[PDB]
Amino acid sequence: AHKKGLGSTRNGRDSQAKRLGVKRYEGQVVRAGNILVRQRGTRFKPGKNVGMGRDFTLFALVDGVVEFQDRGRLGRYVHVRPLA
Amino acid sequence: PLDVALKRKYYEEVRPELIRRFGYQNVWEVPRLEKVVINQGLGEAKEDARILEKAAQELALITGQKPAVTRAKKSISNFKLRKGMPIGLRVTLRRDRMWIFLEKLLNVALPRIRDFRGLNPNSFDGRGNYNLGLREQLIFPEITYDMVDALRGMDIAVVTTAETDEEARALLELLGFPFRK
Amino acid sequence: LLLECTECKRRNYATEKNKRNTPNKLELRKYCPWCRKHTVHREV
Amino acid sequence: MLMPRRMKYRKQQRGRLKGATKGGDYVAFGDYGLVALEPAWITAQQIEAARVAMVRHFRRGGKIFIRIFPDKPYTKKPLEVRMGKGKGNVEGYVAVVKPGRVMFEVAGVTEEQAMEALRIAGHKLPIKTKIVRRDAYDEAQ
Amino acid sequence: KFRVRNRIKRTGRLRLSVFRSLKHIYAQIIDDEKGVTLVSASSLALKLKGNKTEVARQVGRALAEKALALGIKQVAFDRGPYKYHGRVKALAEGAREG
RNA sequence: GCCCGGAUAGCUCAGUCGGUAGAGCAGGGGAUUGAAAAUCCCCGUGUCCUUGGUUCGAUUCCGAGUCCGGGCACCA
RNA sequence: GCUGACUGGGGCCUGUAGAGCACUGAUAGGGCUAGGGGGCCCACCAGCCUACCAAACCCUGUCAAACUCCGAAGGGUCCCA
RNA sequence: UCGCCUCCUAAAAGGUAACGGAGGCGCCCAAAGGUCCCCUCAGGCGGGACGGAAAUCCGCCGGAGAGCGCAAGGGUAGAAGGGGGCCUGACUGCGAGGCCUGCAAGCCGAGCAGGGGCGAAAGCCGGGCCUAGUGAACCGGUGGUCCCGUGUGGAAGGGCCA
RNA sequence: UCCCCCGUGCCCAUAGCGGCGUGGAACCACCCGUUCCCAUUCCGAACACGGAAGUGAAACGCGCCAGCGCCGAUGGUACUGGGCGGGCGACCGCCUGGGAGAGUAGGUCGGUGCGGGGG
């Protein structure tokens, strides 16, 4: 029973998925610390009461509420309008 | 001094002629030298361990300024050396110093060029401003046949207000540039 | 090359990394010791 | 035979055939078209064959416009082999064709010669075809 | 160009913007967010001496004393294309420091 | 990882028991020859790997950084 | 102990279907045309022509999982019912 | 073929398999790090002695196609790019709070104290434009050290920190 | 409240390119200098200081223009939440909700906040 012989591929890899993205959206209450975006660039630029880590990660600097903002050529900002 | 021949000549002779030739309304529209940047290429100096800081301290006598030590931006194996430590030698002259340099060049140096029939009249081309290049650097007074060792030429770009080379041609010819008609 | 660093004349360690051939020798640098605050540190 | 000169990638996924043609659906060059009535992959060998027949008919005569181009690679595992072990080898190339695509076109010819030539070609194609004229295909102003 | 826009490094309230003209020198204490100018002092445009850097000290002193009154103790020092030098508003007053 | 051995001319290598730098061979000219070798003559090559030091000096003595050469272990 | 699924209204998040050629490549016909091949033809190096290979540019036509100037339906999420 | 990273497949949150398509990693930088101050690309068309078709020089045109050590993607000149000055925060003691998530890992982190660096200052600095360059425990080795020390004092040998 | 300029934000090209006219009394620039502060891998070019003869040429501000760029309906299609049909298959079709992209008409040579100086 004559078995045909076959090859191999040099292909079968991908990396671990890395769960990127926005983590809180407009109008979600947040505490200081809360990370808001996991990103690979300045896909969003940090706004009011928003810091950004060595890895581009945006985060709430206060306990507030999130607002987004497109400024066309200036890009997109995430802010935390504080409640108090 | 704050005044030299050419400088005077420009104002009390050429300035007006041009206003008469081309009919300018404003003092500023009247073309004027901007600068004369002079430069040496120097494909050697790189190699044979060549310090060749001989050229700048020498150049400084003629131009009157300590030149600046320019360097290569890519790596070219083909044409040797690798970006950086590289070589080239460039000085920028404005005001008096510019004038003193041209004064001497036109009135003296171009005279003892080896051949000579006049400066090439195809080295502006619209693109206002004028380029020319030399071979021997001893053609200037300050340089002596004792001082030399290698004959390093140079490029002279002279930049002006003139937007067309018509009106720029006039300016230079009237300042005393002998052109090869 | 892996590398440690000493509050010159005693204890403490900080630990780094030089490139020997590349700019290397006598690695010395102004770092802080918890060993009463703070001095010049050598390699080893 | 009829293939690109380069490709970004050597092999590519098969995909599907939604209706319509997207474009290439109106005349534009010559004075008579051969239009698609069904989707299909058309192989370079078919295109060529048809084209040659066209010419052969009005031998060396008018002009021909081949409006589909086989950019898609066509894989096929070696014969007799079992499954797995990566994608197959590239055997040829196809042009994706969808109903209402004007695949051919002719100029400088009698309607009699044309009508006929095309018919002939329609035979070499593995799909149903229709002949066309130059109606309201003049997308102007 | 003069892009410079180190002012773009404005992260934390109360801009003292400075504009230096060949002739004069002007300066305003600006609130961003509100987009609003509060207090504002000038060279001979506030009617003052025929000098320059010595005038700068005076238009400084002048700005401050006005603002102090309004609460303002502390700010940040601007002039964008400044090259922080010369025409320096080293006034007493303000708690913007330096 | 720890103990050995080494570095000297272009190449392979001798040695004051601290005071001289040398074979051999390759290399270049000259004699021989029907020749190419082997012969026989003359002439070049020295950071004695490295800074320190002992001493009246050092090339061999000692500290030493350095590069190769072994040798015996070890490896959670 | 009413907070659930699911539903209504508001607000963010998105890059598929479709479409498009602005980027990355592929591509038909025509024009113009750097180089190169080759005929005219000579070393005084130019010069003219080409129903040949061929950049960019122009006109007209297309294609794409790893293209996107563009982009639905839907989907995810928080608030209030 | 076996771990890790990029892209697609993946059906517009996340996640998503196959001996599906196609590439990278097992390093590197004492400046390629901190801060302050400056500077702006690739091309294209002229023009210029040696000078190619980019050596260096001049002038226009050129928002980004350059560059950012290295694969890809994202991002980016209103710098993350280039150049210079002082520097060592490539800190020690801590960490509100979150991302991710079967576990254990992985990741971001404001702010407080110590003692610093750059800045007039506002401020910024707990390595590097970002996402690979990695290996739990066990068993040992070094250097430290408030600790334990088999009747007592010390040793031997342990623990603790690195 | 109304002009004009000087600062400084917001909207994010309907703000732009390119053309064409204007403006110097005031602002602003270019300008006059390079002693002094401060500067240049060489240059007072740039940065900086002291000025005020000259110009609005450059740059900036204000107007007009649609050639290019930008924006862009309506209608109709594509695609599709959900409901259901035909074909042997590739795929096609009807319902009810949603509804592009290209393209046609058309529009655009900006709008606005605060503060200052001048009628």
UniProtKB/Swiss-Prot annotation, chain A:
Alphabetical list of Pfam families matching this protein: Ribosomal_L27
Gene Ontology biological process terms, A to Z: translation
Single Gene Ontology MF annotation: structural constituent of ribosome
Annotated stretches, region: Disordered: 1-20
A GO CC term assigned to this protein in UniProt: cytosolic large ribosomal subunit
Keywords annotated in UniProt: Ribonucleoprotein, Ribosomal protein
InterPro entries: Ribosomal_bL27, Ribosomal_bL27_CS
Record-linked PANTHER family: LARGE RIBOSOMAL SUBUNIT PROTEIN BL27M, RIBOSOMAL PROTEIN L27
Subunit structure and binding partners: Part of the 50S ribosomal subunit.
Family classification: Belongs to the bacterial ribosomal protein bL27 family.
Functional note: Found on the solvent side of the large subunit.
Protein name in UniProt: Large ribosomal subunit protein bL27
Gene: rpmA
UniProtKB/Swiss-Prot annotation, chain B:
Signal peptide positions on this chain: none
Gene Ontology biological process terms in this record: translation
Top-level taxon: Bacteria
Function of the protein: This is one of the proteins that bind and probably mediate the attachment of the 5S RNA into the large ribosomal subunit, where it forms part of the central protuberance. In the 70S ribosome it contacts protein S13 of the 30S subunit (forming bridge B1b) connecting the head of the 30S subunit to the top of the 50S subunit. The bridge itself contacts the P site tRNA and is implicated in movement during ribosome translocation.
Family the entry assigns: Belongs to the universal ribosomal protein uL5 family.
Complexes and interactors: Part of the 50S ribosomal subunit; part of the 5S rRNA/uL5/uL18/bL25 (TL7) subcomplex; has also been isolated as a complex with 5S rRNA, bL25 (TL7) and DNA binding protein II. Forms a bridge to the 30S subunit in the 70S ribosome, contacting protein uS13; this bridge is straddled by the 5S rRNA. Contacts the P site tRNA.
Designated name of the protein: Large ribosomal subunit protein uL5
Gene Ontology molecular functions: rRNA binding; structural constituent of ribosome; tRNA binding
GO cellular component terms listed in the entry, alphabetical order: ribonucleoprotein complex; ribosome
Pfam families cross-referenced by the UniProt entry: Ribosomal_L5, Ribosomal_L5_C
PANTHER family per record: 60S RIBOSOMAL PROTEIN L11-RELATED (PTHR11994)
Cited PROSITE patterns: RIBOSOMAL_L5
Lineage of the species this protein comes from: Bacteria, Thermotogati, Deinococcota, Deinococci, Thermales
UniProt keyword terms in alphabetical order: Ribonucleoprotein, Ribosomal protein, RNA-binding, rRNA-binding, tRNA-binding
From Swiss-Prot, chain C:
Residue pairs linked by disulfide bridges in the UniProt entry: none
One cellular component term from this protein's GO annotations in UniProt: ribonucleoprotein complex
GO biological process: translation
Top-rank taxon: Bacteria
Keyword terms of this UniProt record: Ribonucleoprotein, Ribosomal protein, RNA-binding, rRNA-binding, tRNA-binding
GO molecular function: rRNA binding; structural constituent of ribosome; tRNA binding
UniProt key word Thylakoid: no
Quaternary data: Part of the 50S ribosomal subunit.
Protein purpose: Found on the solvent side of the large subunit.
Homology family: Belongs to the bacterial ribosomal protein bL33 family.
Protein name: Large ribosomal subunit protein bL33
First-to-last residue of the parent protein present: 9 to 52 of 54
Curated annotation (Swiss-Prot), chain D:
This protein's UniProt keywords: Ribonucleoprotein, Ribosomal protein, RNA-binding, rRNA-binding, tRNA-binding
Protein name in UniProt: Large ribosomal subunit protein uL16
SUPFAM superfamilies xref list: Ribosomal protein L16p/L10e
Listed GO MF terms: rRNA binding; structural constituent of ribosome; tRNA binding
Lineage: Bacteria, Thermotogati, Deinococcota, Deinococci, Thermales
Taxonomic superkingdom: Bacteria
Any matching Pfam family: Ribosomal_L16
Function noted in UniProt: This protein binds directly to 23S rRNA. Interacts with the A site tRNA.
GO cellular component term of the entry, any: cytosolic large ribosomal subunit
